[PDB]
């Protein structure tokens, strides 16, 4: 029963494009979704996409027999520095399935047990930072989460120490990364990207790409210098062979993959931890239930791998934070062939879709009327949640490769934070979500009061 | 018989003032002493002093029945920020005696045992930093020594965490202290200090004093707005009573003492550790001997107080570094009465002397013809070194109140460094000594290779 698709307001020949001229475009799209419903058409000069918000349509978009992963505009601009790495490659690119087969073992259960001590190393650094604050002081939450998550992927992935906790400024890599993502986001609104008004933006972009590549050079030269048997992600990038084609990755792809894993392997986990902590401080009964679980399970001076796997409620906290503010908040798909979506919306081969993950997660037919409430108990019975209703890690063969890594890291760190400190929302912080493609609270600060529980090596 | 002392080149009414013209004045004066010998006169508008370089004259200068501590012109400029704190007070000022009696308990044996655990906390942070460096990186030595020494006095003295190891740039207290010390030093070489052309200097000096004073306020607030009472130097400043007068220190003097202990309680110790590591990387046999002592003695995951006291050779290394580059490189005396120095130099009451410590420490009649060589064995038995030949901590009742604190800190940290790493002078560093009144190597860099010995939790 062919329906006509809704569409937000237009700007003459620019069509919908100026609706993206904002530093909060995903948030602006959620508002549009609220007015127009489960699907809307979005036009720009030479381009059309459809934004999906209901589980009813997204479950169809998630059928890999009908839709493949698409590079959204955001990912095409990101590709300028991440190339054909795993996040920004098409599914049919030879380097996609190649990298995937080679690197998949680095996220096995045996690898995870292996990473756990390194994760603990960095989590201790966070805890001791906060134990060593004086009575004035407060904590800058997303800044410290970025220190922890970047350092964790550096050490676990590459045996490389960013030493973020030794700098009172952001690490230079972070400064260039952030500016690069922000440039990619700002580029989304540009009708004429080659106008001279943007020459300065382009110069800065190339400088940031260079800083990122200077750091990759040191990661690689440090590994050749030592040689010593790490068996980590970087070992597999340099040595591993694809069981299908027999080939290793080439040098150019390796570099893209290092960049890829440094960024995707940390930015969104920093966001998650930041949002989790925000929700916990604003929902003191949930904070208490979470802290009780941490105190009952984490009975040794440092957490074991087994003990992290026992933090069920902490996991539920993290899932509910991902429900409300999934930190990579969209993914894109293209129609393999002419098809009809939902019995109502005809699509032509190649047509593009955008899944608005935060809206999917507010679908009242799935989650009920109180979709804004922070309630981790929504995840008491994960097997009862409808298929394709909860997608913070994407879909199918193109789903997040580091999902278990990120969940383990965040569960360990959050568990230790709740074991070691009581937290005060001392400014009565008002949520301000900064967008850099990814989502993070900006300006979130708290005070921690040490419970004075001794920590271990 | 009675002699006339030499004097270097004078420039009319400016006297010797234009002679220096350098950011390395102590190094210059050491060269003048090489030329002119054990004693020379040095004059500037409105002041005269006499630079002493030999043990035979300095042993008389150190007789406290004949000479008391003088505020050199340097210290008089330091006094513009440090007031009548212990370092910049006259021996006869009521505030010297009061603070001396009130703070001296903070350097008791039982106090020192109490500091050990907090010194270990900071030293563990140092070692952890160096363990976490990547293969391509290097260590900036005086920068990290300053992070360690500042943090140690902050914690032990005031229960305050500077958190220097969580910072890229130096703490702003350091930046402002360095500019203030540098201003004091430069004022010494300034013809017409009150020619309005130096108003920008005085603006900057006042701004740096304010920064140092804003930190003092945070330390006192943190102590007052914090119930968990300690028993440290600040506790005695805020509450202690002078047994003689029965009076506590007033608020103005307390503030001067905090500034004074934060500066004197770290800067020179930083210098010492930097010079000591410099001399170890230039003398591999000495390095190896010190490393072997550290391995043999430091057998536990963290050092105990008793273990630090068994590190004899490490202490000898530190003393030999102090011989060659004592980091507070002069002290001043005045004549209590008319007297004859060394049976040849008549002095009237009030006449000033300057002990040029690096030159004293190079007196060939005491140490031999090899005085420039780094040889810690000179200090195997320090009772067999003549009286007043070795004075890096000053003299008598005005000697360093923190000498044991400094020696224990530096011994601990050097021991742990030697236990945990091999060191490489990877740039073949050429010694460059920065002067800010005090002395420090500038630009000194090494590479450390971990010996991969685990470190224990902080005690
Ligand atoms: C809270 C943490 C994280 C979230 C919310 C997240 C989310 C996602 C999403 C939504 C995708 C799908 C992208 C698309 O379809 O366009 C994805 C893919 C990916 N993620 Fe994550 N992720 C997280 C953590 C990590 C970590 C820790 C790593 C690496 C250590 C990582 C590596 C990747 C990679 C390589 C891909 C591309 C996979 C492929 O297509 O072969 N992610 N992730
Ligand atoms: C290697 C390290 C050190 C050296 C070379 C050093 C050297 C000296 C010297 C030469 C003096 C006498 C100054 C004069 O006569 O004008 C002095 C006094 C002083 N030192 Fe140190 N010192 C060091 C470490 C420390 C430490 C760690 C502290 C504090 C914890 C400290 C506190 C002081 C104080 C307060 C005075 C003035 C004492 C008085 O006259 O009552 N020193 N020091
Ligand atoms: C190299 C690994 C870096 C991974 C980057 C992570 C970004 C993931 C989220 C991208 C979502 C962007 C959504 C922005 C608004 C939007 O609707 N864009 C449409 C479009 O880009 O075509
Ligand atoms: C408040 C804490 C004290 C901090 C400062 C300690 C300084 C200790 C060393 C002082 C050395 C003074 C050297 C003066 C040499 C010099 O430049 N003479 C020339 C002149 O007097 O004109």
Curated annotation (Swiss-Prot), chain B:
Changing residue 82 to F: 800-fold binding affinity for laurate as substrate. High coupling of NADPH consumption to laurate formation. Very much more effective in indole hydroxylation. Favors omega-2 hydroxylation. The record marks 268 as: Important for catalytic activity. Changing residue 330 to P: Enhanced activity with small non-natural substrates with altered product profiles compared to wild-type. Changing residue 264 to Q: No effective fatty acid oxidation. No effect on electron transport from NADPH to FMN. Nearly wild-type level of high-spin conversion with laurate/dodecanoate, palmitoleate and arachidonate. (9Z)-hexadecenoate binds at residue 51. Residues 1-459 are annotated as: Cytochrome P450. Functions as a fatty acid monooxygenase. Catalyzes hydroxylation of fatty acids at omega-1, omega-2 and omega-3 positions. Shows activity toward medium and long-chain fatty acids, with optimum chain lengths of 12, 14 and 16 carbons (lauric, myristic, and palmitic acids). Able to metabolize some of these primary metabolites to secondary and tertiary products. Marginal activity towards short chain lengths of 8-10 carbons. Hydroxylates highly branched fatty acids, which play an essential role in membrane fluidity regulation. In the N-terminal section; belongs to the cytochrome P450 family. This is Bifunctional cytochrome P450/NADPH--P450 reductase. The chain holds residues 2 to 460 of 1049 of the full protein.
